[PDB]
UniProtKB/Swiss-Prot annotation:
Function: Co-chaperone that regulates diverse cellular pathways, such as programmed cell death and stress responses.
Subunit structure: Binds to the ATPase domain of HSP70/HSC70 chaperones.
Native organism: Arabidopsis thaliana
Name recorded for this polypeptide: BAG family molecular chaperone regulator 2
Membrane-spanning segments: none
Domain BAG: residue ranges: 8-86
Superkingdom of source: Eukaryota
């Protein structure tokens, strides 16, 4: 139900910002001339996408979908940034 939905989205948001933290680290490393293992850029890609499917699987109406929305929208932004890091790195 509702509470169960607000909950699922909240857990994901929490994991998503932890994922953004790892992306930010890769971004700075690669941005400063350093190198990052390709498999790590790939492992991060699957984690972001994994959160995205988990999100979509969640159903809800009202604030519950407004939240999930900005969340998968944020995830889209991260996946696309990571696509550019992969190009810039390898």
């Amino acid at each position: 139900g509702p509470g169960s939905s607000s909950k699922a989205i909240s857990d994901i948001s929490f994991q998503v910002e932890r994922l953004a933290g790892q992306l930010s680290a890769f971004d700075t490393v690669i941005g400063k001339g350093g190198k990052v293992e390709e498999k790590n850029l790939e492992n991060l890609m699957e984690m972001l996408m994994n959160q995205l499917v988990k999100l979509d699987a969640i159903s809800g109406d009202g604030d519950v979908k407004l939240k999930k929305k900005m969340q998968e929208e944020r995830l889209h932004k991260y996946v696309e940034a990571l696509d550019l890091l992969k190009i810039k790195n390898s």
